[PDB]
Design an enzyme around this catalytic site. Structure first.
Site, PDB file in Angstrom:
ATOM      1  N   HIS A   1      52.802  39.793  43.172  1.00  0.00           N
ATOM      2  CA  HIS A   1      52.847  40.470  44.473  1.00  0.00           C
ATOM      3  C   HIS A   1      54.136  41.257  44.652  1.00  0.00           C
ATOM      4  O   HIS A   1      54.128  42.321  45.299  1.00  0.00           O
ATOM      5  CB  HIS A   1      52.671  39.498  45.631  1.00  0.00           C
ATOM      6  CG  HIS A   1      51.249  39.095  45.830  1.00  0.00           C
ATOM      7  ND1 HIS A   1      50.733  38.734  47.058  1.00  0.00           N
ATOM      8  CD2 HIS A   1      50.217  39.024  44.954  1.00  0.00           C
ATOM      9  CE1 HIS A   1      49.447  38.460  46.926  1.00  0.00           C
ATOM     10  NE2 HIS A   1      49.110  38.626  45.661  1.00  0.00           N
TER      11      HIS A   1
ATOM     12  N   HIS B   1      44.583  35.142  36.356  1.00  0.00           N
ATOM     13  CA  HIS B   1      43.680  34.121  36.844  1.00  0.00           C
ATOM     14  C   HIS B   1      43.337  33.050  35.838  1.00  0.00           C
ATOM     15  O   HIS B   1      42.559  32.138  36.138  1.00  0.00           O
ATOM     16  CB  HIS B   1      42.482  34.790  37.493  1.00  0.00           C
ATOM     17  CG  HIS B   1      42.876  35.584  38.696  1.00  0.00           C
ATOM     18  ND1 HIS B   1      42.003  36.408  39.383  1.00  0.00           N
ATOM     19  CD2 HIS B   1      44.056  35.650  39.354  1.00  0.00           C
ATOM     20  CE1 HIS B   1      42.645  36.946  40.410  1.00  0.00           C
ATOM     21  NE2 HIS B   1      43.888  36.504  40.416  1.00  0.00           N
TER      22      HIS B   1
HETATM   23  C1  HEM Z   1      41.797  42.945  41.748  1.00  0.00           C
HETATM   24  C2  HEM Z   1      43.145  42.200  41.722  1.00  0.00           C
HETATM   25  C3  HEM Z   1      43.564  40.811  42.189  1.00  0.00           C
HETATM   26  C4  HEM Z   1      42.990  40.245  43.280  1.00  0.00           C
HETATM   27  C5  HEM Z   1      41.945  40.642  44.307  1.00  0.00           C
HETATM   28  C6  HEM Z   1      43.613  38.931  43.317  1.00  0.00           C
HETATM   29  C7  HEM Z   1      43.388  37.909  44.256  1.00  0.00           C
HETATM   30  C8  HEM Z   1      43.888  36.639  44.458  1.00  0.00           C
HETATM   31  C9  HEM Z   1      43.649  35.689  45.542  1.00  0.00           C
HETATM   32  C10 HEM Z   1      42.813  36.058  46.754  1.00  0.00           C
HETATM   33  C11 HEM Z   1      44.456  34.706  45.139  1.00  0.00           C
HETATM   34  C12 HEM Z   1      44.576  33.393  45.943  1.00  0.00           C
HETATM   35  C13 HEM Z   1      45.730  33.200  46.958  1.00  0.00           C
HETATM   36  C14 HEM Z   1      45.675  31.846  47.451  1.00  0.00           C
HETATM   37  O1  HEM Z   1      44.661  31.531  48.253  1.00  0.00           O
HETATM   38  O2  HEM Z   1      46.499  30.982  47.167  1.00  0.00           O
HETATM   39  C15 HEM Z   1      45.193  34.921  43.914  1.00  0.00           C
HETATM   40  C16 HEM Z   1      45.896  33.894  43.257  1.00  0.00           C
HETATM   41  C17 HEM Z   1      46.506  34.163  42.023  1.00  0.00           C
HETATM   42  N1  HEM Z   1      46.625  35.370  41.400  1.00  0.00           N
HETATM   43 FE1  HEM Z   1      45.426  36.997  41.728  1.00  0.00          FE
HETATM   44  N2  HEM Z   1      44.514  38.686  42.323  1.00  0.00           N
HETATM   45  C18 HEM Z   1      44.488  39.889  41.597  1.00  0.00           C
HETATM   46  C19 HEM Z   1      45.312  40.229  40.520  1.00  0.00           C
HETATM   47  C20 HEM Z   1      46.170  39.315  39.958  1.00  0.00           C
HETATM   48  C21 HEM Z   1      47.071  39.679  38.882  1.00  0.00           C
HETATM   49  C22 HEM Z   1      47.217  41.098  38.278  1.00  0.00           C
HETATM   50  C23 HEM Z   1      47.790  38.597  38.596  1.00  0.00           C
HETATM   51  C24 HEM Z   1      48.910  38.287  37.582  1.00  0.00           C
HETATM   52  C25 HEM Z   1      48.948  38.979  36.223  1.00  0.00           C
HETATM   53  C26 HEM Z   1      47.456  37.459  39.414  1.00  0.00           C
HETATM   54  C27 HEM Z   1      47.701  36.110  39.337  1.00  0.00           C
HETATM   55  C28 HEM Z   1      47.397  35.129  40.293  1.00  0.00           C
HETATM   56  C29 HEM Z   1      47.808  33.748  40.162  1.00  0.00           C
HETATM   57  C30 HEM Z   1      48.570  33.174  38.991  1.00  0.00           C
HETATM   58  C31 HEM Z   1      47.248  33.173  41.245  1.00  0.00           C
HETATM   59  C32 HEM Z   1      47.145  31.670  41.517  1.00  0.00           C
HETATM   60  C33 HEM Z   1      48.203  31.154  42.608  1.00  0.00           C
HETATM   61  C34 HEM Z   1      48.412  29.730  42.801  1.00  0.00           C
HETATM   62  O3  HEM Z   1      47.885  28.947  41.926  1.00  0.00           O
HETATM   63  O4  HEM Z   1      49.106  29.358  43.787  1.00  0.00           O
HETATM   64  N3  HEM Z   1      46.461  37.967  40.231  1.00  0.00           N
HETATM   65  N4  HEM Z   1      44.789  36.163  43.535  1.00  0.00           N
HETATM   66  C1  LIG Z   2      47.322  37.784  43.633  1.00  0.00           C
HETATM   67  N1  LIG Z   2      48.192  37.555  43.052  1.00  0.00           N
END
Ligand code: HEM
Ligand SMILES: [C-]#N
Ligand code: HEM
Ligand SMILES: [C-]#N
Lengths: 714, 711
Positions: free
Chosen positions: B79, B242
């Site tokens: 972010h 993810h």
């Molecule tokens: C179309 C693009 C993306 C969308 C819509 C998206 C969406 C989301 C959402 C809605 C969450 C959950 C927030 C929560 O409820 O805690 C999240 C968590 C996460 N995102 Fe994505 N994300 C995207 C791209 C990415 C990218 C590019 C990365 C890193 C290279 C990333 C890595 C993560 C990680 C590691 C978490 C897990 C957080 C945790 O375990 O606390 N995301 N994302």
């Molecule tokens: C979403 N990181």
């Protein structure tokens, strides 16, 4: 569109932009620019001669009424100084801010854009030698002099601003020409200098637009009082001013005038209120929407205004601009005045509701009657009031520059006496330092007293400060925040030192209580730093004097009384705004940036100089030891904060695990760990290797504040 | 109450506050502070060691999922970097602005206030030696490495900001989580990097909140393209990210979370989203569940779960759209985040299904699944790119973890395999340039065309490299291709003749000749006005080749408005002066520097197509304050030119005869209240010398913006 603002998303967000204004001076002026030095190079008489000639040099794009621009320039000057408020010392003519939004576009300043534009050639001719601020007041003076009335004096020294003052709250209204600040006249919301948004003092048609002279007088009296003027000065100013010129309202301004300057087309080049077909047509000039001259000879000083007002009966009517105005009953005045632009036509005098208010109000009537009976007294009062109006925000006599400055110093200048003795030297300074520290006074007592003395300074109108030691006089000696009883004890001890020092000398050398108060504060800060292992030497400027009661208008200092004091963690139990908002407003008056304010408060809490000696915000186990403990403990997540039950301003810092009460604090302390920007500053100071930096920054800010009123370097 | 800003009274008032941010640097840092020098003293390995320990050191106020904060930190870093937009280079991780409003309170950043708070002790321990901006990215890298995946590299050097960037326009919406920027997916309003206000790229539930994966893919594709990423990079980043962690949605956030940070009570001390009725019940996005069986381990778990099973849309426990597996093989396959003794079923977001249902993304994902090594390296390279895109050229990348390999998105520069010219050679070349058939205007216009592409937001552009001579800049309309070629041809011949006449190994680059010619021309213009000025010149710029230039990426630097050349593209939506201010901010100019620049420039006459627009002087190529004197003369009246979209006429007030022609670029300096005050200073009788010196100082400052090797 627009990048939006955090203020729009979060209306309650702390307004730190006001402090950012203190971090730099916008504009192209060099860092080493000394205006006073430049004005000294100015041939004031040459500028006055050029202004005199301008008075009768009519420009086609805005023809002069009666062939003389004098009255227009007087109005420009009155409006420039007229926004001053004693409450915070803001507004006023000192920075020439009538040139910037929002003031440049207030309905009451309609067409002053053309008046200021007439002065551009003179401004360009003299350049840096004369500021717009000084020039606008000088134009008003020359206008009055050219029409038969010698002014009391004139001082230069007003440095031009290059933007608006973001700290001024002009009122709660969301629309110009509306009011949500009073229900009954004379009951205006505190802190405001006018009864309507966008007006200088009051509505010319009467309160709420109703032609009620009696009620109008109540608002006139209250607003002028809030601008430091009493009944006699008020009547003298209004009558003196309306002795000249006329009001303009050939038709309704709402439907015949174009957008105000800030909303006008780029081709208008800063002007506004373009008249629909006829900006150069003087015969159809429109400004306030009210039409007519007050006197038979609008460009000559005489008793015409007072005579027309008092010797005739007036009745409320509807003018050609749809505004309320008064006309005479008898025909003795019908067409008794030449038309401002048509040589073959005449016009009948008129009065505003606010003018009739001077005749109806019992107290004002008595003054006007006396003036009419004694034209000499009328002149004396108007001259002195005009000088006061146009110079009240310039500060002490030392700031008044030029050959036209009166020899007489006025009480509203809060004058300081001369030192009839020799100043102490380095050896003496060191001796006094040790003696004060070896007294029965503690570091906290010394810091608190020095702060109480210096903290009254406000950069808005340059009033207050440690020079003069007015802290020991009424009314400051009895202000609750200064803890009268405690203050007496400290002052007595310092006075004893002063006595012993003065009696031990055999060379004419003496020390003032003003300097000892500051020197004591400095010694105490050095000591607190020493206790933490840091050797600091605060620069000290000897020369402050002790002012007496005879040269102190006690009632006028009430405006400097703090409602909130961050250094002392004092919060008046009655304030409307959140404590931190007041803290920021006050910090602005001391010219502090957010970082300086943060270093000051945080460092101060390690010393512990609180009101009533509370431990609020004193997050340290070693008081009177200057360290960054406030930040280290404030940022520690091991502590959780919550509002104190059965409290108004207190919060408790509990151990997040055990629930043990670790600390107590107020919003003043906690804002530094809540606001996004302040927290980023707090994190720097609370870092492992930032203690020395915090100490040095605290000392630099302390020194800065102690020296704010020392214009012995200007 | 609070003073009603002028912007409230007049919504269309020029936003000069953005230029005032260039006038002062808020915060307590020393004036002569050098972050690079401080970061150089840092023991990076020691910080990484502390971060690795932190990953498994759960704090009671925000208990770690799976006993490892790694995934949360990866999200924090993604972010931080993810707000970057190529259009203006703004947003991004370089100043750590996620810490300030409004970003700190965007719905997409919920609970990252807790993530950043976990890093406070390390930040305090190292102090000025590591910035928040550098620490946030480093925490993400350490998280990834600790969970079994080697990163491609890491560079420090991001200096912390102390306030938000006031120049960023985040969009037209007046409410977070709403969008008024696209009518069809993949057709978002130009200049925006996200499809919704307050989100990083797209809505995780689908476009307009509809769980349509094919449509979601169109917005994913466009938004990531606006953040410099292609299909392989985009798929690798999403799938890679993810592979770790989970989404939190124990209940609906709309009614179970307290105010965001900026609106939260003072006792919250900077935190927000306080859960009303936190670990087992964490609510962040409102969507709930892990993507994979082992959320704290690098593996093929995300791609396998996504591609090997069929998924169906449903409303989850937080009331948001999410997808569940149709097969029972994945039921209770994941340990519960706060209880290893219990199990949970994985989920997919509509944006993950988008990667499977969009044809182009599906092909990429199939290749990744078949070749884990290809998936891994694409993710490693894209993660490095994502987190370093706004850091500028290679010289700005600091520390022992910087890869030896330089990537094309760094806009690399070749080394100067020769000796630099000295004062004597500089003078010679200066004379040679002035003796050529090139005019003062051609020289100034060309140097400006070279230097003016610099933007302080992402440190791209500028005169170093002489990319003005390469695609795409050599063909930009604003650069007058034909005219530019004439100038470059002459300078290249001077370069050739000089380099050949040498024997000591000394050479001069075209990049330096372009700037030197511009300086010589400004000096000549000042001399024509009677002023002797010497502009400081810094030799050392090099000539970059097409192989050091990703041409398509440079189109983001193409100007829509150019104040110095009085160029206004006929398609801009905003008023020209608003674009002028936006552009001035990218050159780090204050309102006064911009005024000195434009005013001085108009006396020189360097306009696009050699027009006389705003050239209010009877003697061009002579540096004076004539622009101001003539602009302020009340003997002239202004009006829009009939049948003209951008022009205005200045007429004699007592004749009606046309005296001058101008655009809004010129006239704003006589209309805006603050700019008029500056113009009045420069148009005064004894201000010409000051204007000349201020113009020269600004010119020199702009010429040197990309010289990261001085102060
Ligand atoms: C179309 C693009 C993306 C969308 C819509 C998206 C969406 C989301 C959402 C809605 C969450 C959950 C927030 C929560 O409820 O805690 C999240 C968590 C996460 N995102 Fe994505 N994300 C995207 C791209 C990415 C990218 C590019 C990365 C890193 C290279 C990333 C890595 C993560 C990680 C590691 C978490 C897990 C957080 C945790 O375990 O606390 N995301 N994302
Ligand atoms: C979403 N990181
Ligand atoms: C209760 C306070 C006052 C009110 C409500 C007030 C009101 C007004 C109005 C409505 C106008 C006419 C604007 C226009 O249409 O052109 C005007 C003009 C004028 N006012 Fe006052 N005024 C007040 C006090 C003062 C003071 C204190 C002075 C100066 C010592 C002053 C001097 C003038 C002059 C000289 C003009 C005439 C300008 C001209 O001929 O163009 N006024 N005032
Ligand atoms: C009013 N003047």
């Amino acid at each position: 569109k627009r990048p939006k603002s955090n203020q729009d998303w979060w209306p309650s967000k702390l307004n730190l932009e006001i402090l950012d204004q203190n971090a730099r001076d916008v504009g192209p002026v060099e860092d080493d620019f000394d205006y006073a030095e430049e004005f000294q190079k100015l041939d004031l008489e040459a500028v006055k001669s050029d202004l005199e000639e301008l008075m009768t040099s009519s420009q086609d794009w805005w023809p002069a009424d009666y062939g003389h621009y004098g009255p227009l320039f007087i109005r420009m000057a009155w409006h420039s100084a007229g926004t001053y408020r004693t409450a915070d010392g803001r507004g006023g003519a000192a920075g020439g801010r009538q040139r910037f939004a929002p003031i440049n576009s207030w309905p009451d300043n309609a067409n002053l854009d053309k008046a200021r534009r007439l002065l551009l050639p003179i401004k360009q001719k003299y350049g840096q030698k004369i500021s717009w601020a000084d020039l606008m007041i000088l134009a008003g003076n020359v206008a009055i002099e050219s029409m038969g009335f010698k002014t009391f004096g004139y001082a230069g020294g007003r440095e031009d601003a290059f933007e608006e003052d973001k700290a001024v709250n002009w009122g709660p209204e969301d629309e110009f020409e509306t009011q949500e600040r009073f229900d009954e006249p004379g009951e205006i919301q505190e802190g405001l200098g006018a009864s309507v948004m966008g007006l200088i003092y009051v509505n010319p048609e009467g309160p709420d637009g109703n032609p009620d002279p009696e009620a109008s007088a109540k608002n006139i009296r209250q607003t002028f009082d809030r601008m430091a003027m009493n009944d006699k000065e008020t009547a003298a100013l209004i009558a003196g001013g309306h002795t000249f010129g006329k009001v303009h309202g050939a038709d309704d301004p709402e439907e015949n005038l174009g957008p105000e300057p800030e909303a006008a087309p780029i081709e208008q080049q800063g002007l506004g209120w373009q008249n629909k077909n006829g900006n150069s047509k003087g015969g159809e000039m429109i400004t306030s929407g009210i039409e007519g001259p007050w006197t038979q000879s609008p460009t000559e000083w005489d008793m015409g205004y007072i005579n027309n007002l008092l010797d005739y009966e007036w009745e409320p009517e509807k003018g050609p601009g749809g505004a309320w105005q008064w006309a005479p009953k008898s025909e003795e005045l019908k067409n008794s005045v030449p038309d401002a632009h048509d040589p073959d036509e005449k016009q009948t005098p008129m009065m505003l509701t606010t003018d009739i208010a001077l005749k109806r109000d019992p107290d004002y009537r008595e003054v006007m009657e006396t003036f009419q009976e004694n034209p000499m007294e009328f002149g004396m009062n108007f001259a002195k009031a005009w000088y006061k109006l146009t110079h009240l925000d310039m500060g002490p006599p030392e700031r008044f520059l030029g050959p036209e400055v009166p020899d007489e110093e006025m009480i509203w200048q809060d004058p300081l006496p001369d030192a009839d003795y020799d100043l102490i030297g380095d050896e003496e300074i060191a001796e006094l330092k040790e003696e004060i520290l070896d007294s029965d006074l503690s570091v906290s007592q010394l810091v608190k007293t020095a702060w109480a003395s210096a903290s009254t300074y406000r950069d808005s109108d340059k009033r207050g400060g440690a020079n003069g030691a007015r802290l020991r006089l009424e009314p400051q000696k009895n202000w609750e925040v200064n803890e009268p009883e405690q203050l007496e004890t400290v002052l007595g001890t310092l006075e004893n030192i002063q006595t012993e020092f003065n009696d031990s000398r055999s060379d004419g050398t003496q020390v003032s209580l003003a300097d000892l108060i500051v020197l004591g504060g400095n010694a105490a800060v050095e000591q607190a730093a020493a206790n933490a292992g840091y050797d600091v030497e605060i620069p000290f400027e000897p020369g402050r004097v002790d002012a007496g009661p005879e040269h102190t208008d006690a009632p006028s200092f009430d405006a400097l009384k703090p409602k909130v004091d961050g250094v002392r963690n004092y919060i008046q139990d009655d304030i409307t705004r959140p404590a931190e908002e007041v803290l920021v407003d006050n910090a602005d008056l001391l010219n502090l940036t957010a970082s300086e304010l943060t270093a000051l408060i945080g460092g101060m809490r390690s010393i512990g100089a609180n009101y009533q000696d509370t431990d609020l915000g004193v997050f340290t186990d070693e008081p009177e030891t200057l360290t960054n403990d406030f930040f280290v403990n404030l940022l520690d997540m091991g502590t959780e904060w919550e509002p104190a039950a059965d409290s108004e301003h207190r919060y408790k810092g509990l151990d997040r695990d055990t629930g043990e009460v670790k600390w107590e604090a107020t919003r003043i302390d906690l804002i530094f760990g809540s606001n996004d920007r302040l927290r980023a500053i707090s994190e720097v100071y609370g870092s492992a290797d930032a203690e020395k930096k915090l100490v040095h920054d605290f000392v630099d800010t302390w020194s800065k504040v102690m020296k704010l009123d020392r214009f012995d370097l200007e």
